[model samples]
Target: SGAIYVGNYRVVNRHLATHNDWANLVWEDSSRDLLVSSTTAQGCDTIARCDCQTGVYYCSSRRKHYPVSFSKPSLIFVEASEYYPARYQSHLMLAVGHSEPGDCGGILRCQHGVVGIVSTGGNGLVGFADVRDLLWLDEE
Candidate 1:
C-alpha cells in the first residue's frame, strides 16, 4: 500500500479524502501531539513546483489546528518534504514558536493552539528545538 506514516496518523487517500490531483500529508511531533499538514489539497497546487530561489514549496498558507501546549516557550522546527505521485518532490521548513505571539512570522492563534509562520528571515535554518511535558490542550 502507498502510505506515509507519522506519529499516530497515516495520511493515506482514505484518511485525507483528497482529489487525485493532490497529495495530502501530515507531519506530527508525536512527542507533543503536535501535527502539521505540511502539504494539503487546499491553498497551493498539487503539482509540486519549486520556489526557484530556494527550490522549496510550502503549503501556500494552509493553516490547521495545533493542540499542543508548552510549559514556558519553545521553538518548533519542521523539516519536511513531500512526494507527488511520481517522485516529484516539494520541500518545506516551517518554524513556529511559543515564545511570543507572531514573533516568527504570520499569525498565531496561540489560544486555540494553532499557529502558522511564513518564512521571512535566516536561511530557513533555525538549528533545533523540541517539545516535552506538553499536554494536548485540545483534549484530543
Candidate 2:
C-alpha cells in the first residue's frame, strides 16, 4: 500500500436560516442561538440581553418555547455609553429581571455567569422586544 488512512471526522451540512438581511454572513442555523439587542432608550442608550434559560425563557413571553444558549459567551451591552451606538433594528436588549416583566433597551455586561440582563424603555419600540424576536434574522 502507498497511502494510509486514519482518524475520524464529522461533517455537517448547512441550510438557509436567517436572522436579518442587513447583517452580513449572519446566518440562522442550528449552530446559531437567539440574542436580544434593542434601541429602545429612555436616556437613549443601546442594550442587550443573553437569554441562557431557554425552556424558562418564555415564562414571561407567549406559550411558545424558544431556544436560548447559556453555554457560549455572547456580547452583551450593559451601558449604552460604554457600548457602540445604535446600528441595526436587530440590535436589541432586554430587562434584567425575570420574575417580574419589564422593558428593553440598555446594555448588559456579563459579570458573574452565562447570559446577562438589562432594562429597556419606550412604547411600541418594536414588534417584539424579547430575545428571540429582537436579534431574529428574519424578514417581514
Candidate 3:
C-alpha cells in the first residue's frame, strides 16, 4: 500500500529535513507528511503502474494554477543527499527533465494509476518521491 502519517504525533513536512546550509549540497527535496483526524490518507495503489517507465508518464500539479503536462521519468535513485538519515531517510525517487517551472506537489500518473508527486525541481530536472517507497501506517 501507501505510506502513512504519524497518528498521535504532529505530521511534519520533510522539507524540514535538511543538512546545514553549508555542505557538499543543499537539497531542495519536496515532500510532506500530513496528519488528519477524520478519514485521511488510507493506503496505496500499485508499483507496476510506474517503474521508471521512460516518457510513459504525466506530471500533474499546481503552484500558480493546475496543469498535467507530459513529464518524462528520466531517472530513479535513492534520495539521501544532505538530509538527516533518520529525519529524511533515503527512498526510491524520480526526476523529470521538464522545464515548465511548476507542479511541485502535483501528481505524476501513468495509464493505470498515479506514480508519484512532483517534489522539487532544479535547473536540470524536477524530482519526486516514488509512491512505492513511502511510509505506511499499519505497516509500522
RMSD of each: 16.7, 18.5, 9.8
Tell me the whole-model lDDT of each prediction, alpha carbons only. Answer: 0.26, 0.25, 0.38
Please list the residue runs of candidate 3 whose C-alpha ends up more than 4 Å from where it truly belongs after superposition.
1-13, 16-52, 55-89, 99-102, 133-140
Decoy 3 TM-score against native: 0.39
Residue 118 lDDT in model 2? Answer: 24
Best by TM-score: 3
Ranking by TM-score: 3, 1, 2
- Candidates 1 and 2 compared: the better one by lDDT is 1
What is the C-alpha lDDT profile of model 1 across 21-56, one tens digit per residue? 134334444223233333332221112112111111
- Model 1 TM-score is 0.18
**For residues 1-140, could you state the per-residue lDDT of candidate 3 as single tens digits?**
11213332112224432232213221234323221122234445333334444423333432232233333433434345443232442333444455232444445555545555445555656555455343342232
How many collisions between residues are there in candidate 1?
Answer: 0
Task: Write down the worst ten-residue block by lDDT for model 2.
Answer: 1-10
What does the lDDT come to for candidate 1?
0.26
Candidate 2 ranges beyond 4 A from true positions: 1-56, 69-71, 79-140
